[PDB]
């Protein structure tokens, strides 16, 4: 096709969608996996905290939701006749959001795995756990802010 | 009338004051009635100093004797001769 | 005892599939990729139903 | 002897388990020997009081 | 295609009838199971009939 | 899962009917359903025999679930009647509404013209065709999404009844109406436009059938960007109820915590509710997934 | 020119990977869950049926992989546009690797859950909740694959 | 060779036909090896269970049969001047069945090993072992499904 819109342009858009969803899923998976191991190890003796130690699992799910939202928003700017620009910018946004979500999932999983035992041994530490979870979730929040800003820049002034 | 259950029915907390003589009979008829949940009254008193410990251990001993009898039964050629009828009689205790 | 209910459903299933084959039905035969030859496969499935009925008799005689 | 016992062993076993539960509930009560011995509380459905 | 709507009217009439004419004892479970059974049966049948109603695609067959 | 504390409305009652029908939707087949129903029935007639014997580690859960699988198999009867496959083979009880050409070329691609409609279930002409699978994917997609949405609405009306049984004057205004309006405006609008898309003869009307998911999402992207409106004034409906759904969020966030000290719980409940609604609505697609499996 | 002969390669690899990666994820999940179950049920046979749940709702990942594979391959074509092939590859990769992550999480969460439930039974509901939040990952992968393949033939020239 | 039927087109078809049987055989071998270690170590003490605990071995054999069926059906469809489309489809089917069967063999080998070790002392776990082995087997079955349907789709409507 035209040099501004080569036939291989959709590679970068599709790979951006895939990378966003896959890397956010990997981050959420590590987070929920470490947090679930921690919970099932810590509330087996103390089952009454079980319903409220699930917060890191919830935040991992929220990271997954970040990934889904960015992936669908990138997917619904795709096209066969899409500009190289569009392909590369969606690829960048997807990679950014996916890897930021992977980092956020790593952080949430590790800190929640520590904090579940920390709380089961000391209830007052739960507030600190939740604050750290918020701070780790804001990383994925930054990732999605970057992804949406790139997506907004993607379509305007296209040729 | 009917007392069906969507999620529950309005249930009451009831206290019981009973004479000593008929206490065991009231407990037995209530158990074969089986409708009330007793909340905690003397949970502070630990197991080794409960009121009825001696008859508890006597009943444990007779239960062990019954298990010994059933061991002999399984070692021999007989098992639950009254199982057909005794099980029904215990089941027939409902509303009886 | 395992063969009992297996043959029980097998007789019915074989009989119905045999009837469908013998009736030359579209959902089973007619297509080129299908075996065609409706009567032949129907006869074979009749024989299969007969042998499953034989297993039924043999297993149920133990009751 | 074993045949005679088996003819009623199930009945005695079920019964003695029932009095086991009965005495467990008895200890669960607020019994006090200095007065009317047995007194307790329970949860009952209102529509069968 | 108002045939599905007519089927809806008749099944809803049957459900409303059985709601009152349900057994006067064990009302809760009987009423709930019958009304939801009929309603969801109708829902699935309506989905199927509407899908088969105005097709957007036609089948491909390379064999007899 | 948990214990229903008091005289509210629980979930145990609707389960007796929703459970078997959801399983059947995910399982529809006369053959396998018939085998499982015969298993249940043979576990039901001999109930008195089984009441006085121990099922054992082969039938423990089966003994506990002795009656669930019966109505389960009945709903499997239904779903196989609609998913017309019997051991993946379609029945011919009802005449097909679609007629093949009078002279089909051996080995050549063959088309079908809709010369009628099938009373119950998929038309058996679909069986063994290349486009059948896609047709089935689309139909299930929509069937599963409608059933899941209606289940959500039923449960949320259970929430309404629960709140209304008590006073809960703050609770209803804070949670039910904003959440209900959001859920309706998005997913019920999706469902009703799906139904209307089915109702209108797109091929006969000449108007192209718009992309379903695009008509779902261009609301969230750019209102009025409609390739082909379902109905007149469609874009106005888009912007109107999209603004309604957007203002549901401050409604779901502000009115309930008023006197707030419970604002921390309210905000997590609101975000959890919205993401959880979209998550369940998505999860409703695996009824489709199991059906295809 | 928009239809290279190698265009179906991307679609074929996407269709393959959609079941490959999901199969590996579900396989690890089932392996870990099964070893946990049979390591716990030796000391408590009767809870086997309830402890099987990790295996089932880990194999749901392979179910997602299969359904994406079929819904992608039924869009394969000899004359498919390079763009169709790339979108199919992207959807296949999305579902496959999302399912792989979900399989990892479900496997080890179910292992921990069965070890915990071997002691006391109230952990059952909690391990369910956590592994639901793990399986929703494969759910989101299914979502992405579905929307990508839906767009894959929108306005193809 | 024409554009749609290149000389290197049979590469992908032949390597798909192979990789099916290679990877399925690898999975079956891994499963059989771990199951054999388990069976030997568990029924040296309890030999009466030899005829029973052998089932995962036959299940790995069924995985091998899956690979054999895919390979033998793909082999017949292989052709000198076949379209490169058919080559890619056959390669995809071969990989999709082979790697899925390898994963199934991994899972079934681990589960069968651990389950037969468990069944040495407790006999009622046999049914649960069978059910989990079925859930592992269905993965290779899904691989069979996808490979067969690609293979059928490979030849139809080809230039």
UniProtKB/Swiss-Prot annotation, chains A, H:
Residue numbers on the Vacuolar membrane side: 1-8, 75-90, 151-159
Intracellular or extracellular location(s): Vacuole membrane
UniProt KW Disulfide bond keyword: no
Disulphide bridges: none
Chief subcellular location: membrane
Top-level taxon: Eukaryota
Membrane topology: Multi-pass membrane protein
Biological role: Proton-conducting pore forming subunit of the V0 complex of vacuolar(H+)-ATPase (V-ATPase), a multisubunit enzyme composed of a peripheral complex (V1) that hydrolyzes ATP and a membrane integral complex (V0) that translocates protons. V-ATPase is responsible for acidifying and maintaining the pH of intracellular compartments.
Entry similarity comment: Belongs to the V-ATPase proteolipid subunit family.
Other notes: Present with 8450 molecules/cell in log phase SD medium.
PANTHER family: V-TYPE PROTON ATPASE PROTEOLIPID SUBUNIT
Protein name listed in UniProt: V-type proton ATPase subunit c
Source organism per UniProt: Saccharomyces cerevisiae (strain ATCC 204508 / S288c) (Baker's yeast)
Swiss-Prot record, chain B:
Subcellular location: Vacuole membrane
Modification comment: Glycosylated.
Record-annotated disulphide pairs: none
Superkingdom assignment: Eukaryota
Functional summary from the UniProt entry: Subunit of the V0 complex of vacuolar(H+)-ATPase (V-ATPase), a multisubunit enzyme composed of a peripheral complex (V1) that hydrolyzes ATP and a membrane integral complex (V0) that translocates protons. V-ATPase is responsible for acidifying and maintaining the pH of intracellular compartments. Is present only in vacuolar V-ATPase complexes; enzymes containing this subunit have a 4-fold higher ratio of proton transport to ATP hydrolysis than complexes containing the Golgi/endosomal isoform and undergo reversible dissociation of V1 and V0 in response to glucose depletion.
Family per record: Belongs to the V-ATPase 116 kDa subunit family.
Subunit structure: V-ATPase is a heteromultimeric enzyme composed of a peripheral catalytic V1 complex (components A to H) attached to an integral membrane V0 proton pore complex (components: a, c, c', c'', d, e, f and VOA1).
Miscellaneous remark of the record: Present with 55714 molecules/cell in log phase SD medium.
Name of protein: V-type proton ATPase subunit a, vacuolar isoform
Organism, scientific name: Saccharomyces cerevisiae (strain ATCC 204508 / S288c) (Baker's yeast)
Encoding gene, per UniProt annotation: VPH1
Covered residues, full protein: 4 to 99 of 840
Curated annotation (Swiss-Prot), chain D:
Top-rank taxon, per record: Eukaryota
Subcellular location: Vacuole membrane
Post-translational modification remark: Glycosylated.
Function recorded in the entry: Subunit of the V0 complex of vacuolar(H+)-ATPase (V-ATPase), a multisubunit enzyme composed of a peripheral complex (V1) that hydrolyzes ATP and a membrane integral complex (V0) that translocates protons. V-ATPase is responsible for acidifying and maintaining the pH of intracellular compartments. Is present only in vacuolar V-ATPase complexes; enzymes containing this subunit have a 4-fold higher ratio of proton transport to ATP hydrolysis than complexes containing the Golgi/endosomal isoform and undergo reversible dissociation of V1 and V0 in response to glucose depletion.
Subunit structure: V-ATPase is a heteromultimeric enzyme composed of a peripheral catalytic V1 complex (components A to H) attached to an integral membrane V0 proton pore complex (components: a, c, c', c'', d, e, f and VOA1).
Note: Present with 55714 molecules/cell in log phase SD medium.
Family of the protein in this entry: Belongs to the V-ATPase 116 kDa subunit family.
Protein name per the record: V-type proton ATPase subunit a, vacuolar isoform
Residues of the full protein shown: 298 to 346 of 840
Swiss-Prot record, chain G:
Chain positions of site Essential for proton translocation: 135
One term under GO cellular component: proton-transporting V-type ATPase complex
Vacuolar side: 1-6, 73-88, 149-157
Cytoplasmic topological segments: 30-51, 111-122
Predominant place of localization: membrane
Stored InterPro entries: ATPase_proteolipid_c-like_dom, ATPase_proteolipid_csu, ATPase_proteolipid_su_C_euk, F/V-ATP_Csub_sf
Cellular location(s): Vacuole membrane
Pfam families the UniProt entry points to: ATP-synt_C (PF00137)
Membrane-crossing residue ranges in chain numbering: 7-29, 52-72, 89-110, 123-148
GO terms for MF: proton transmembrane transporter activity; proton-transporting ATPase activity, rotational mechanism
One GO-annotated biological process of the protein: intracellular copper ion homeostasis
Membrane association type: Multi-pass membrane protein
UniProt KW keywords: Hydrogen ion transport, Ion transport, Membrane, Transmembrane, Transmembrane helix, Transport, Vacuole
Subunit structure: V-ATPase is a heteromultimeric enzyme composed of a peripheral catalytic V1 complex (components A to H) attached to an integral membrane V0 proton pore complex (components: a, c, c', c'', d, e, f and VOA1). The decameric c-ring forms the proton-conducting pore, and is composed of eight proteolipid subunits c, one subunit c' and one subunit c''.
More about this protein: Present with 8450 molecules/cell in log phase SD medium.
Function per UniProt: Proton-conducting pore forming subunit of the V0 complex of vacuolar(H+)-ATPase (V-ATPase), a multisubunit enzyme composed of a peripheral complex (V1) that hydrolyzes ATP and a membrane integral complex (V0) that translocates protons. V-ATPase is responsible for acidifying and maintaining the pH of intracellular compartments.
